[PDB]
Write a protein that binds this ligand. Structure first.
Ligand SMILES: NC(=O)c1cnc(C(F)(F)F)nc1
Length: 460
């Protein structure tokens, strides 16, 4: 049985509004309703992995697992295996996989982050799951962020706390947060960003939704605007939104948005909004295609509609050669020429680089670079030709060209990372000097750039 080079992943996010689900929720798992929907011809084809994020979930883990597994069995006639389940308050993530993938899945991690302090600590935060699928690392984050149209800054702060403190993936990757630890990272949930228009425009907004005219609404979506100003979800992708706002509905219909201020809303307006979202971030030059992004029309127990997204995701096999793992393969090497980091820091310390990759026996520290002043005030750290030669465990190009090198630039004085990035080895050529580039981030904020040239030697 050959190992796959591609899998399909279902991501679901549903804020259940503290109400039990209806007896049938199969439309969710089938990507049927509004938006970018899945072809009917695919309905019996199971996804490899189903990742279900809920918010305001009133069910026990047991109650929800029974509904999920029974749903997927009805659709696919497959009995899914439970990879992981993790609940923080009423925020829950479930990972289910086809039984044939049990042997391919390892290193399962779960974690949660609680957001806010005193007042604002009590029900918002995130749960997450990571694991290895053969040679590919997968992360999944389900977050319920701060509510309310006038709290987009709080949401951005909640996001930064989650990406700093959620402890998933390989703990040896100590300079890197979840935004660098995975081949593919999926981040979804009730992110609670709103359509920022005047309250008086509520009926105009509803009119526009009834006409399926979303363009003037999406231009005021806080998540799109904050992302375009690099305030949140830097370097993440989201599929175009072609479904109606998923909040806030009157329960037991979808014919009505309930937007008016009420005691139950803290006298806040809830203008129709895309609260419920799916974003992703994959390493450079890995295959990832969104094949659906939409909302269900027939599940009406909550004031939110469920959202689905499906993805084709590139995966690699767990490679073994006569040499590595357990030693290096001297027919392989990674060299770096004309390299320099540009940092936004106003500080003056020396810096060195750390290279981390599962193609190395362990991480590699460089010599200190030479600091120079850039023409526009920037700190430029010159490595020139001084970076070490990296020694991969396996030289076969069918392995090595599928790998990535994570880079941290660290202060010599504190050993603290000032910036993290990632370089793909999926080069246009081997044994050839080729430009490389990555932005550098720290706590998910842009801190600089790393650029230079690479020269990769494989066994071919
Ligand atoms: N390595 C594991 O502990 C593992 C457990 N369970 C599964 C499941 F749920 F797919 F069957 N896959 C892997």
């Amino acid at each position: 049985q050959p190992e796959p080079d591609m899998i399909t992943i279902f991501i679901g996010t549903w804020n259940m509004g503290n109400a039990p689900p209806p007896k049938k929720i199969t439309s969710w798992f089938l990507s049927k309703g509004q938006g970018k929907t899945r072809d009917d011809s695919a309905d019996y084809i199971p996804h490899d992995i189903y990742v279900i994020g809920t918010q305001e979930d009133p069910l026990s883990e047991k109650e929800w697992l029974e509904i999920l597994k029974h749903s997927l069995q009805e659709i696919t006639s497959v009995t899914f295996k439970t990879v992981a389940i993790h609940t923080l308050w009423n925020i829950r993530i479930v990972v289910l996989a086809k039984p044939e993938h049990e042997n391919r899945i390892s290193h399962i991690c779960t974690d949660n982050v609680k957001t806010g302090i005193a007042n604002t600590l009590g029900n918002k935060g995130a749960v997450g799951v990571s694991f290895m699928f053969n040679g590919t690392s997968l992360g999944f984050v389900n977050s319920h962020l701060t509510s309310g149209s006038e709290k987009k800054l709080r949401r951005n702060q909640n996001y930064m706390n989650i990406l700093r403190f959620l402890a998933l993936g390989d703990k040896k990757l100590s300079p890197f947060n979840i935004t660098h630890r995975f081949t593919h990272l999926f981040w979804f949930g009730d992110l609670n960003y709103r359509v920022d228009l005047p309250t008086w425009e509520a009926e105009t907004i509803i009119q526009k939704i009834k006409q399926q005219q979303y363009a003037d609404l999406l231009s005021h979506d806080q998540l799109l605007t904050e992302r375009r100003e690099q305030k949140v979800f830097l370097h993440f992708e989201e599929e175009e939104i072609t479904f109606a706002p998923t909040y806030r509905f009157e329960r037991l219909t979808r014919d009505k948005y309930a937007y008016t201020k009420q005691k139950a809303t803290g006298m806040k307006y809830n203008l129709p909004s895309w609260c419920d979202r799916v974003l992703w971030k994959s390493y450079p030059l890995v295959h990832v295609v969104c094949q659906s992004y939409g909302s269900t029309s027939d599940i009406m127990t909550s004031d939110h509609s469920p959202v689905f997204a499906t993805f084709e995701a590139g995966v690699t096999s767990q490679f073994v050669s006569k040499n590595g793992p357990g030693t290096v393969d001297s027919q392989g090497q990674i060299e770096f020429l004309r390299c320099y980091a540009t940092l936004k820091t106003k500080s003056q310390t020396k810096f060195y680089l750390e290279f981390h990759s599962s193609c190395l026996e362990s991480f590699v520290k460089s010599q200190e670079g030479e600091n120079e002043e850039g023409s526009e005030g920037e700190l430029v750290v010159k490595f020139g030709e001084t970076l070490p030669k990296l020694k991969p465990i396996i030289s076969d190009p069918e392995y090595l060209l599928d790998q990535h090198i994570l880079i941290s630039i660290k202060s010599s004085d504190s050993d603290e990372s000032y910036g993290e990035g990632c370089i793909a080895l999926r080069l246009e050529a081997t044994e050839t000097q080729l430009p490389i580039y990555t932005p550098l981030t720290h706590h998910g904020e842009l801190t600089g750039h790393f650029q230079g040239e690479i020269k990769l030697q494989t066994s071919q």
